[PDB]
Each structure stands twice: as C-alpha cells, then as structure tokens.
C-alpha cells in the first residue's frame, strides 16, 4: 500500500481494489473520449499540501470525502482533485470548455491528468455542476460550500472534521 501521486494529489490505499476498463465517456463539452474507468470500491488516505483527507470511490462515483480542516486553498484543491480522481459522472459533465488530449507536437496526453489540469483552473464550474446536499446534523462534522466556508449545505459527499 505505498504512497503515490496523481499530480498534485497524493494517495495511499486503505482498502479495496479497482479494475480498469476503457470506456467511451461523453464529456460535458459534447465530445466523446475513451478513458480508463475504474470499477471497484476503493478507499484512500489523500493529501494535497497541508490538507489531509479520506476518500472513498466506486465506479464513476465519489462515495465520500472526509477532510481535516486546513488552509482554504489546500481544502479546495484536495476537493477538486478527489472529484477528478473519483471519475464521478458529474465531474465529466462539468467540463464545458475545450480539452485537448494531444499536445502541439501531436504527442499523447493522459485524459485524467488533462482533467486535473482543466479543473484546478475551473473549480467554480465543477462545484456548480456537482451540487449540494444538507450538511451533517452532528457536532463534530460540518458542511463546506464553494467558498470553503462552514455552511448548512455541503458539496455532495464531502464533510469536514476538526479532530
């Protein structure tokens, strides 16, 4: 279970096993792109900068992300990166602009890394497409909105702890 990266995101497996299959994904800008889609419930310690979290995913779905509160920019990037890494259907649909899967020399680019790069610059569109649900009714857990503020609605599947 060794530490590994997905760009700015760092992960370490807690549980589960994924199996990858290539699928044709309809992305939110109207294009269809072939992307390795993971199947399986998997769970990971995650990190971005000084922000720690726990992520659970299943096929094309962020099941849950529990983050330990931290500087806001690092909370926000951790959230964006977990949305991309979960391969959630809503994340794909959130892409409204152009995305290239070849560079200017005609070289091959990673669809997932390209998504990461796209969304770290377009998080408002992502949060807007992703949506909100009621925050937890427990004292030791709080909701978080698009501004990384504690709120009565939280990004779906995302909760913050101070413990």
Residues of this chain that bind ligand M7G (CB under 6 A): 6, 18, 20, 36, 38, 42, 85, 110-112
What tokens were used for 110?
A: 């990673």
Measured CA to CA, the distance from residue 99 to residue 114 in angstroms comes to 7
Helix axes 123-130, 72-86, angle to 10 degrees: 60
- Measured from the CB atom, the residue of 45 and 136 that comes closer to ligand M7G is 45
Minimum Å gap between C-beta 136 and ligand M7G is 26
Closest contact distance (angstroms) between CB of 42 and ligand M7G is 5
Provide the minimum distance between the beta carbon of 45 and ligand M7G in the complex, in angstroms, as a whole number: 13
Alpha-carbon distances, residue 62 vs 57, 66, 79, 86 (angstroms): 5, 11, 11, 5
Query: CA–CA separation, 87 vs 6, rounded Å?
Result: 13
Question: Closest separation between CB of residue 81 and ligand M7G, Å?
Answer: 10
Q: Give 112 or 120: the residue with its C-beta nearer to ligand M7G.
A: 112
Q: Are 17 and 43 in contact (CB under 8 A)?
A: no
Q: Which is nearer to ligand M7G, 42 or 74 (CB)?
A: 42
Residue (18 or 49) nearer to ligand M7G, CB: 18
Percentages helix, strand, coil for the chain (3-state, rounded to 5) are: 25, 40, 35
Taking the complex as a whole, the smallest distance from the CB of residue 132 to ligand M7G amounts, in Å, to 25
Q: Name the residue whose CB lies closest to ligand M7G.
A: 36
9 or 51: whose CB is closer to ligand M7G?
Answer: 9
């Amino acid at each position: 279970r060794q530490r590994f990266r997905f760009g700015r995101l760092e992960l370490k497996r807690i549980s589960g096993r994924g199996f990858k299959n290539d699928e044709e994904i309809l992305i939110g800008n109207g294009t269809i792109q072939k992307i390795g889609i993971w199947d399986g419930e998997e769970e990971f310690h995650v990190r971005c900068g000084e922000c720690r979290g726990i992520l659970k995913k299943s096929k094309m779905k962020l099941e849950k992300l529990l983050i330990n509160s931290a500087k806001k920019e690092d909370m926000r990037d951790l959230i964006i990166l977990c949305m991309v890494f979960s391969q959630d259907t809503r994340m794909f649909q959130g892409v409204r602009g152009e995305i290239n899967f070849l560079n200017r020399a005609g070289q091959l680019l990673s669809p997932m890394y390209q998504l990461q790069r796209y969304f770290l610059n377009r998080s408002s569109d992502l949060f807007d497409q992703w949506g909100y649900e009621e925050s937890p009714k427990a004292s030791e857990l709080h909701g978080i909105n698009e501004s990384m503020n504690a709120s009565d609605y939280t990004l779906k599947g995302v909760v913050v702890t101070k413990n």
